[PDB]
Design a binder for this molecule. Structure first.
Ligand SMILES: C/C=C(\Oc1cccc(C(=O)O)c1O)C(=O)O
Length: 435
C-alpha cells in the first residue's frame, strides 16, 4: 500500500466519484464506491464474484464459474463464500437484496427461480479517499497512471441537473396504500412500508449525479456502483447492521419523519413537533423494541442495550427520530447471522415482520431487489458494515428509475402517503445529471 496527499480545495466525495468515473471507464471495469465514516473506499475491478440466488450459489473467477446447490439459511451460504473470498483480500463489497430477508419469516417458497439475494465481490484494487489523503492498495501501473492523469487534470464541474416529474401514479400506489389500510383495520398487522418506482426518461450520469446529490444529503453511508450490469447510487439514512472485529454489533433504527431542507425557521418547528409528537414517538418506540428483540437472537445474554434513544437525525430532505442499539455477538453466532436477524430492516418492511414482509409481496412490485436491501462492506478480520438502501437511483438494461416508499399505519391516508413519497424522492430528483 502507498499513499498520496489530498489536493487542497478538493472534497474527497468529488474526488472519489471522479476516480470511479474516469479511471474505471478507461479500463472498462465494474466497481463499487462505499462512503463509511469520512473514508470513500473505491473497490475497483472484480477479482472474484459471489452470486447468491434463491436456487443457486455461483463463484466466478477469471472466466470460470463454480456452481453449487444450497439449503438452510441464506446467510450461512453467503457467509461461507465470502469467508473464502476474504482469505485472498482484506475487504469484499456488494449488495444484498430485500429478498435475502424473507427466509427467516418463512417466505422462501414465494421467490421465483433465479431471484437474486446477494452479489459480493473481491476487488482487484482499492483506492481510499479522505480529507487527508488517497491510499492505494494493489493499483497496477495502468490504474496509477490514470489516477495521475485525473489528479493532473482536476475534477469536472458538475453541470446543471435535468428534472423529472414524480407526481404521476402509474403503479397505483394510492390504491395499494388503501388495501394496506383496510388490512391494518382488520388487525392483520400494525404497519407496512409500500413503495412506488418512478421512471427516469433519460440516461443519467451516475458519478456526476452522485456528486451533486451528495452536497444536499447528510448520509450515514453512501454508495456509487456499476456491477454485473446494474448501475446504482444512493444516500443511506441508517445502518441496518455493523459488526466490528471485536464482536460489537450495532443497529440504528430510524422511525418518525418530518420535512427538512425548507429553511431554518420551518425546520425548527418541524423538529419540535417531531420530538414531542405522540404518533411519531409511539412508532419509534415500537421499532426500537422490535429491533432489540431481533438483536437479542444473536447477542451474548444481557449484552443488548439502547445506547442512543429517540434523538433527531438529520437526513437532507427529511429529519427522523433515531436510536442506536448495541450488543456483543454471541460466540455461537456470526456476522451473517447478525445481518439475517436484523433483515429486512424494520424501517423499510413492517410490524410484525412476518405479516409485514408478506404484505409487501402482495401489495408492492416484487422483487424489490436492491431497494430496501443493503449495500455491504466486509473485512477479513470479521467486520461487516451494512447500509440500508433507500434514496437510490438504478439503471438496469435500458431502464433508469427511482423508488421511494412510506410506512402505512391504521390512520394513514393515500394522498398524504403519496406526498410523503414525493418528499422522499426530493432528496434525489433535483440532482439528476443527464448523460
Ligand atoms: C429512514 C427512516 C425513514 O425513511 C424511509 C422509510 C421507508 C422508505 C423510505 C424511502 O426513501 O423509500 C424512507 O426514506 C422513515 O420514514 O421512517
Amino acid at each position: 500500500s502507498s499513499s498520496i496527499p489530498m489536493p487542497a480545495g478538493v472534497n474527497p466525495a468529488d474526488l472519489a466519484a471522479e476516480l470511479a468515473a474516469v479511471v474505471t471507464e478507461s479500463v472498462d471495469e465494474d466497481y463499487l464506491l462505499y462512503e463509511c465514516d469520512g473514508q470513500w473506499v473505491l473497490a475497483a475491478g472484480v477479482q472474484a464474484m459471489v452470486e447468491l440466488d434463491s436456487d443457486e450459489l455461483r463463484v466466478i473467477r477469471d472466466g470460470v464459474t463454480r456452481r453449487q446447490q444450497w439449503s438452510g439459511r441464506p446467510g450461512a451460504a453467503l457467509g461461507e463464500a465470502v469467508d473464502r473470498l476474504l482469505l485472498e483480500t482484506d475487504q469484499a463489497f456488494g449488495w444484498v437484496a430485500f429478498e435475502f430477508g424473507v427466509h427467516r419469516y418463512g417466505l422462501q417458497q414465494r421467490l421465483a427461480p433465479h431471484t437474486p439475494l446477494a452479489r459480493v465481490f473481491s476487488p482487484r484494487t482499492r483506492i481510499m479517499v479522505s480529507e487527508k489523503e488517497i491510499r492505494l492498495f494493489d493499483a497496477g501501473i495502468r490504474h496509477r497512471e490514470a489516477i495521475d492523469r485525473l489528479l493532473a487534470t482536476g475534477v469536472r464541474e458538475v453541470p446543471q441537473s435535468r428534472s423529472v416529474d414524480v407526481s404521476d401514479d402509474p403503479s397505483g400506489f394510492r390504491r395499494r396504500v388503501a388495501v394496506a389500510v383496510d388490512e391494518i383495520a382488520a388487525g392483520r398487522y400494525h404497519k407496512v412500508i409500500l413503495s412506488r418506482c418512478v421512471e427516469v426518461p433519460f440516461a443519467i450520469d451516475f458519478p456526476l449525479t452522485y456528486r451533486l446529490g451528495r452536497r444536499h444529503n447528510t448520509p450515514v453511508r453512501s454508495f456509487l456502483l456499476q456491477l454485473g450490469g446494474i448501475r446504482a447510487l444512493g444516500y443511506s439514512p441508517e445502518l441496518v447492521t455493523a459488526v466490528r472485529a471485536d464482536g460489537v454489533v450495532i443497529t440504528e433504527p430510524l422511525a418518525g419523519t418530518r420535512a427538512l431542507g425548507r429553511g431554518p425557521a420551518i425546520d425548527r418547528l418541524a423538529r419540535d413537533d417531531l420530538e414531542s409528537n405522540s404518533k411519531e414517538i409511539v412508532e419509534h418506540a415500537i421499532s426500537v423494541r422490535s429491533s432489540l428483540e431481533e438483536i437479542t437472537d444473536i447477542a451474548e445474554p444481557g449484552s443488548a442495550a439502547v445506547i442512543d434513544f429517540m434523538t433527531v437525525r438529520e437526513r437532507g430532505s427529511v429529519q427522523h427520530l433515531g436510536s442506536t442499539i448495541r450488543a456483543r455477538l454471541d460466540p455461537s453466532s456470526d456476522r451473517m447471522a447478525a445481518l439475517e436477524a436484523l433483515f429486512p430492516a424494520v424501517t423499510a418492511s413492517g410490524i410484525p415482520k412476518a405479516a409485514g414482509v408478506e404484505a409487501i409481496f402482495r401489495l408492492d412490485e416484487c422483487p424489490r431487489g436492491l431497494y430496501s436491501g443493503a449495500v455491504v462492506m466486509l473485512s477479513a478480520d470479521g467486520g461487516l458494515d451494512a447500509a440500508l438502501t433507500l434514496r437510490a437511483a438504478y439503471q438496469v438494461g435500458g431502464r433508469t428509475w427511482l423508488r421511494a416508499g412510506a410506512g402505512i399505519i391504521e390512520e394513514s391516508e393515500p394522498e398524504r402517503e403519496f406526498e410523503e413519497t414525493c418528499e422522499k424522492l426530493s432528496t434525489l430528483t433535483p440532482y439528476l445529471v443527464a448523460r
